[PDB]
Structure 1
């Protein structure tokens, strides 16, 4: 791999509906290949789908290889995809099964349904596996009951899906929860992970990375007034050595040594590079810079430059090559953006950390 800046993965046609693209996610397969997807706002009919683009040259070039269509509901695979190569067998699904979770939503935004698709051929073909969780109207307004934003993580022969939940609307504006499965087909009950006692609080957008000492770093945006007249979405994290037990961990506000106060739509990864504990690397949806921590989340975070533009839920990935040396930074644009595109940069962590 090499450093790359602002490589275009996909530039949408003008006749796509603003924002055209949004919500980048990616995966690196064990052979090193990179896959990228996003919310793809094509005119309907036919129903929207999640495109799957591949790079076999470490991000220099990209080609579409498949599309994940809404074969289960016919509504459209519309919001909040997530790619995940199983690192171990789960039930009848071998290590290396490639999963996509994402939300099936009709054009009228009347419902949400986080569904799970699987590919056994590295993303060439897909089959529906199960519904994870379904809810109400796909708008982020209090009183509504949607589900949103799946994040997948396997541990001990199980798959965990973390997501944002508005269904407990009598008590919370939004929470974050998870469900667990040992077979990809049958899901256990909803477990509340992050709840707050002020109704107008809206924690959201969970992303997890495992640290080398066995702790899990669970990052989220914490929407709140914090007792003022102004709402904000500062980044918070929780630390737990049990990835199914988040509720018992107190939230910790991410503090940056420069004074930047990062907000919205976090992403977190970990590399062995940078020191004896490696480095946690965090993005927000508002800042173009990155935030790093060489002490497992202790102390304050260091803001560093980044050549990739800022974007909503900008996605990070530490590539495996050279023991975690290169970082993918992948944007699909901004909310309601008039000129969104899907792009990627690669940074050399040997130099930038």
Structure 2
């Protein structure tokens, strides 16, 4: 791999509906190939889908290889995709099964349904596997009951889906939860992970990375007034060595040594590069820079430059090559952007950390 800056994965046609693209997610397959997807705001009918673009040259070039269509509901696979190559067998699904989770939503935004698709051929073909969790109207207003934003992680023969939940609307504006499965078909009960006792609090957007000491780094945006008249979405994290037990961990505000206060839609990854504990790398949805931590989340975070533009839930990935030397930084644009596109940069962590 090499350093790359602002490579276009997809530039949408102007007849796509603003924002046209949003919400980048990606995966690296064991052979090193990179896959990318996003919310694809094509005019309907037919129903929206999640496109799957591949790079076989470490991000230099990209080509569409498949599309994940809403074969289960016919509504459209509309919001919040997530790609995940299983690192171990789960039930009847071998290691290397490629999963997509994402939300099936009708055009009228009346409902949400996080569904799970699988591919056994590295993203060429797809089949519906299960519903994970369904809810109400797909708008982030209090009193509504949607579900949102799946994140998938396997551990001990199980798959965990973390997501944001508005269904307990009598008690919380929003929570984050998870469900677990040992077969991808049958999901356990909803487990509350992050809840707060002020109704107007809206923690959301869970992203997890495993650390080399066995702790899991669980990052989220914490929407709150914090007792003031002004709402914000600062980044918080919880640390636990049990990825199914988050509620018992106190939240920790991410503090940056420069004084930048990162907000919205985090993403976190870990590389072995940078020191004896490696480096945790975090993005927000608001800042173009990156935030790093060489002490497993202790102390303060160092803000570093980044050549990729800022964007909503900008996605990070530590590529496997050379033992974690290269970082993908992948944007799909800004909220309600008039000129969104899907792009990627690759940074050489040997040099930038």
Q: TM-score, normalised by structure 1?
A: 1.00
Query: Which consecutive residues of structure 1, in runs of 5 or more, have no partner in the other structure?
Result: none
Mapped to 2, the partners of 1:223 and 1:341 lie a distance apart of 27
Write out per-residue CA displacement over residues 264-294 of structure 1, whole angstroms, 9 at most, x where no aligned residue. Answer: 0000000000000000000000000000000
Mapped to 1, the partners of 2:95 and 2:306 lie a distance apart of 33
Per-residue deviation, 1:341? 0.1
Query: Which consecutive residues of structure 2, in runs of 5 or more, have no partner in the other structure?
Result: none
Write out per-residue CA displacement over residues 34-65 of structure 1, whole angstroms, 9 at most, x where no aligned residue. Answer: 00000000000000000000000000000000
Mapped to 2, the partners of 1:195 and 1:107 lie a distance apart of 30
Write out per-residue CA displacement over residues 194-243 of structure 1, whole angstroms, 9 at most, x where no aligned residue. Answer: 00000000000000000000000000000000000000000000000000
Write out per-residue CA displacement over residues 155-181 of structure 1, whole angstroms, 9 at most, x where no aligned residue. Answer: 000000000000000000000000000
Per-residue deviation, 1:68? 0.0
Mapped to 2, the partners of 1:79 and 1:325 lie a distance apart of 31
Per-residue deviation, 1:150? 0.0
| 1:179-218 → structure 2 map (5 Å cutoff) | 179-218=179-218
Per-residue deviation, 1:152? 0.0
Name 2:239's counterpart in structure 1. 239
Per-residue deviation, 1:4? 0.0
| 3-state DSSP of counterpart to 1:317 | strand
Write out per-residue CA displacement over residues 277-334 of structure 1, whole angstroms, 9 at most, x where no aligned residue. Answer: 0000000000000000000000000000000000000000000000000000000000
Mapped to 2, the partners of 1:115 and 1:8 lie a distance apart of 28
Per-residue deviation, 1:24? 0.1
Mapped to 1, the partners of 2:238 and 2:336 lie a distance apart of 30
Mapped to 2, the partners of 1:281 and 1:46 lie a distance apart of 39
Mapped to 2, the partners of 1:15 and 1:202 lie a distance apart of 33
Tell me which stretches of 4 or more aligned residues in structure 1 moved more than 2 Å: none
Mapped to 2, the partners of 1:190 and 1:335 lie a distance apart of 29
| 3-state DSSP of counterpart to 1:322 | helix
Per-residue deviation, 1:137? 0.0
